[PDB]
Design a protein around this ligand. Sequence first.
Ligand SMILES: *[C@@H]1O[C@H](CO)[C@@H](O)[C@H](O)[C@H]1NC(C)=O
Ligand SMILES: *[C@@H]1O[C@H](CO)[C@@H](O)[C@H](O)[C@H]1NC(C)=O
Ligand SMILES: *[C@@H]1O[C@H](CO)[C@@H](O)[C@H](O)[C@H]1NC(C)=O
Ligand SMILES: *[C@@H]1O[C@H](CO)[C@@H](O)[C@H](O)[C@H]1NC(C)=O
Ligand SMILES: *[C@@H]1O[C@H](CO)[C@@H](O)[C@H](O)[C@H]1NC(C)=O
Ligand SMILES: *[C@@H]1O[C@H](CO)[C@@H](O)[C@H](O)[C@H]1NC(C)=O
Ligand SMILES: *[C@@H]1O[C@H](CO)[C@@H](O)[C@H](O)[C@H]1NC(C)=O
Lengths: 322, 491
Amino acid sequence: CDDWGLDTMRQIQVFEDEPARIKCPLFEHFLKYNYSTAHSSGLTLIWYWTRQDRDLEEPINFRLPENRISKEKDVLWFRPTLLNDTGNYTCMLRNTTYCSKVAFPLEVVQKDSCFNSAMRFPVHKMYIEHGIHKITCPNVDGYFPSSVKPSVTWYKGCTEIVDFHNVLPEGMNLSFFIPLVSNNGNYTCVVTYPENGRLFHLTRTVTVKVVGSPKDALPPQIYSPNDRVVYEKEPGEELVIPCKVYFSFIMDSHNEVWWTIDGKKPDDVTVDITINESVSYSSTEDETRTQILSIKKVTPEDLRRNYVCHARNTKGEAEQAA
Amino acid sequence: ETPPRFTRTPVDQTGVSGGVASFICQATGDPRPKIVWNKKGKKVSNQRFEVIEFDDGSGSVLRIQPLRTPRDEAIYECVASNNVGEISVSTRLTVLREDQIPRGFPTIDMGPQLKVVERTRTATMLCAASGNPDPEITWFKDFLPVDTSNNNGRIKQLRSESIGGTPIRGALQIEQSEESDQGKYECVATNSAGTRYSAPANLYVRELREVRRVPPRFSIPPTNHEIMPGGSVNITCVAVGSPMPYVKWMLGAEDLTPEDDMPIGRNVLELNDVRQSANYTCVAMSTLGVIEAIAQITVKALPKPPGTPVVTESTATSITLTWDSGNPEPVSYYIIQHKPKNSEEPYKEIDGIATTRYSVAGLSPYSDYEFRVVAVNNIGRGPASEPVLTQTSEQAPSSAPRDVQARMLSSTTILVQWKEPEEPNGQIQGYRVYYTMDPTQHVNNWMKHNVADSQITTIGNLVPQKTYSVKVLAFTSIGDGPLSSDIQVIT
Ligand SMILES: *[C@@H]1O[C@H](CO)[C@@H](O)[C@H](O)[C@H]1NC(C)=O
Ligand SMILES: *[C@@H]1O[C@H](CO)[C@@H](O)[C@H](O)[C@H]1NC(C)=O
Ligand SMILES: *[C@@H]1O[C@H](CO)[C@@H](O)[C@H](O)[C@H]1NC(C)=O
Ligand SMILES: *[C@@H]1O[C@H](CO)[C@@H](O)[C@H](O)[C@H]1NC(C)=O
Ligand SMILES: *[C@@H]1O[C@H](CO)[C@@H](O)[C@H](O)[C@H]1NC(C)=O
Ligand SMILES: *[C@@H]1O[C@H](CO)[C@@H](O)[C@H](O)[C@H]1NC(C)=O
Ligand SMILES: *[C@@H]1O[C@H](CO)[C@@H](O)[C@H](O)[C@H]1NC(C)=O
């Protein structure tokens, strides 16, 4: 049988006592075949699992109470999950002459009533005062059909959202009007829906962080070369001038600051140098990067060469200490 | 003796600084050729260059690591030589910088990892690579290429296929792992832009945990049946093993057990309202292969009529029939129908005949008979065969001529007459008249007069005023019948 071993690349985490539904990796990830064109071709999908902290694999008995674990096509359903359900799962596809099979881990995770869990929230970034940005409750597709309508309580950190300055809950969507840095942090939705006379809960959290406007965005800003202070002194050249570069936020930015002393900074011989570095984020996450350098022995001639400071982050700008 | 000839030549490479490049060269010939690697006509001797020979004697790999540029950028040559001749082939290494990586150049998204496998278990080294064009993934072990070129053996090379915006997944699948499989594995991703190596990964081969995976096997296989139509039956199938298998029933192609609900180790198929006969398949599957087993379901009808019976033996009082069963399935027994040819009444029946041959005794000599054969199975009694006509053998007559009379015609002639014997047992071919003046003699010493089939004859040349004793018999082709008791006539 074609074995793809463990597929740790997709580490799967799901909250305790809540409906999970696990698709089978091989079908679209590795194999090129939907369940449909593979089921029609006489092949059979079979699931096996090894509970973590155990050696031997079991098959899963579907004929069990309230169909707690069920199987639908390439997916296997948990309604709900349990802490015990945690392990390495193996799904298999086989004709008499064929066998592909893959494994993957599944981690059932506990969930304190303030939604503090071992889980990994994604991060949404809203442009500041760029009007509405709506958050959508994620991973909710196909847990229930159109025939049913869920009820989603929203939360900020640990407190239910009822009346807010600019935050409006629209069920499966969260409306942020005029997003202010005041509202940052991990937001949780608890979408609740009934299924066959029992109520199921789904819990997801998105960390939303407000950043600076690309209307405020513009090339680096340097002032340590302002020249209001020229730095002539007895040599005695113990004197170094800073290099302050403030960058307005740019979603994809390449922040690079470099001191250019003679045009070839790369550790010139007369002096013994090492590049030194610093970083600071604002409230709306704009950067200031500052650079200053250190020397072992000092040669009197360097004062007569000028020190220009440049930096480019998606834009190129440059000024000198003079 | 034969000159060197390449069986594997190196191809031009584009690698990345800090990474690895390998060149492969292999030759055959007689004597086995040697290989040297040259650069610009000078034999390589370099701090970053290593040469790895193939164990089988067929080559060398030149491995360069870490790449430096332009230092290593050059044309290199593999030169194969023996005492009969020399041949070289050139190849190029290009080495870029990360600040010159084109968009699309292969990346290692995920690389093989330390893995420890128990001997005889499958070990899979895994790799995730991306690029444009979709890169090929190849594998190295201890600086020599993994030879998977034959997809028959112990080691298999798998590849996921390109749903565009994805990493392409590579697997090095080492079945039936053994100690020699231990070593340092690297996955290599290649496209038209160049080649990138993963970090190396060690494989260890460990002695077994005592727990054993048992292949699936039928604990209670599905046993065949026969039942009347509608007609229900429950056929039980049971498989066991470690791990425990699933059991689905099947009507050959179409699945009978709904897939999303497939029982574990024990599936019993209930067959409501059975109609047509069939083969039913019970498939069981664990992770250690698939097994199968059939249950034969049939409904038998009243047996087809036997083959037309054939007369193979006949006596005067018996007829032996032989026949073909005329049936595909076993027959329990037969019934023989029999009657006189010109009887217009129903056949008499001989029941419970357990073979395909039988001797019908109790018959009369020289008589026409009609026979049929009927087959019977557990279901019941089938239609009769097509009939066979025949005739019992003849015998000598078993009764004397009746009312034998004789009277004087003259002093020298008499008139003898009689009636046909009641038991001729065949065609009367004629009569023999015995007569004498001395009835104390043996009849064979009496005077005799042979006659054909008739009831009266004259006998002359008798001596007058004498008492003549007269006896008459009839004869068939078989022999003489009994003689009538003596009568006397006086001349
Ligand atoms: C998957 O989609 C449909 C079935 O839903 C089928 O027509 C199609 O051919 C499948 N895809 C491939 C690549 O076969
Ligand atoms: C663990 O599983 C057992 C049965 O295997 C079940 O009875 C029990 O409720 C589960 N425990 C928890 C804490 O979910
Ligand atoms: C999965 O199996 C690995 C062994 O390859 C083991 O180390 C790990 O703990 C298992 N994890 C789960 C969630 O079963
Ligand atoms: C099993 O599936 C493969 C791939 O679809 C096919 O090539 C092979 O012929 C199939 N065998 C049987 C017995 O259905
Ligand atoms: C949520 O964000 C808070 C900061 O408000 C911090 O505790 C952490 O980064 C997040 N919590 C979890 C459980 O991930
Ligand atoms: C077959 O199984 C059904 C299941 O309910 C049962 O009612 C029936 O009596 C069984 N028939 C035989 C012949 O065992
Ligand atoms: C069942 O299969 C056998 C082959 O082993 C065949 O000879 C027989 O005719 C089949 N019977 C039916 C009813 O298909």
